[PDB]
């Protein structure tokens, strides 16, 4: 398990949290020195917990599938909450088994499903440490009408930062304020599977992608990634989704 406390949080402590998170995940090997997540894992071993505490010292435990960094649900005291989808329903057989009340959220963890539930797209949902604190509080008290937005903040602040150094850096920089994520940040999130697949193909194709991955750069400019020498591959992506889990 790994923990992150908002009270006393700093750019450095957020980085340490993300490093601990990445290191809590088992990997098959490294491709271009990037950890390759496992194809599959048996029962309980497939999940890990992140204990997140807000400024007010209230904690939620978040269940994460270690093969894909997908969040399954979370626990607040003795009430558990799981996404309305197959993966989460399976996770519930193994995690938070003794919760006294088990709530099924009215949506899956899919970005589009969450955005529709939140009534806002990621471009307009603030991130940064104070945002993560607000999200934790919202989830701890389960204010239903704000939960989808809180989950979008939570997912990006844990899974997306773990997957990309760039995202980790952006979120960790905002300690006493919030910010709206750039199209580049969102582009990274949307293309994690594609990038993961192409990097693995490149490893046995002389660094060449079979199919280009189109991303939006810092200047909102559209760019096409086609090989393992790109900066996104050499200096950003921190975890790779196993090709076996990519359709």
UniProtKB/Swiss-Prot annotation:
Reaction(s) catalysed by this chain, per the record, are:
Endohydrolysis of the N-glycosidic bond at one specific adenosine on the 28S rRNA
The question of whether Cell membrane is a record keyword is answered with: no
GO MF annotation, one: rRNA N-glycosylase activity
UniProt biotechnology annotation: Especially useful as immunotoxin for pharmacological applications as it has low toxicity in rats and mice but is potent once inside target cells.
Q: What's an example Gene Ontology biological process for this entry?
A: defense response
Q: Give the sugar-modified residues.
A: 191, 227
Enzyme class, broadest EC rank? hydrolase
What does the UniProt keyword field contain?
A: Glycoprotein, Hydrolase, Plant defense, Protein synthesis inhibitor, Signal, Toxin
Q: What is the effect of changing residue 189 to K?
A: 10-fold reduction in activity
| PTM comment text | Appears to undergo proteolytic cleavage in the C-terminal to produce a shorter protein.
Q: Which residues form a coiled coil?
A: none
The answer to whether UniProt assigns keyword Cell wall biogenesis/degradation to this entry is no
Q: Where is the active site?
A: 160, 189
Q: What is its EC number?
A: 3.2.2.22
Q: Which family does it belong to?
A: Belongs to the ribosome-inactivating protein family. Type 1 RIP subfamily.
Q: What's this chain's function?
A: Ribosome-inactivating protein of type 1, inhibits protein synthesis in animal cells.
Instruction: Give the protein name, as stated in the record.
Output: Ribosome-inactivating protein bryodin I
Tell me what organism the protein belongs to. Answer: Bryonia dioica (Red bryony)
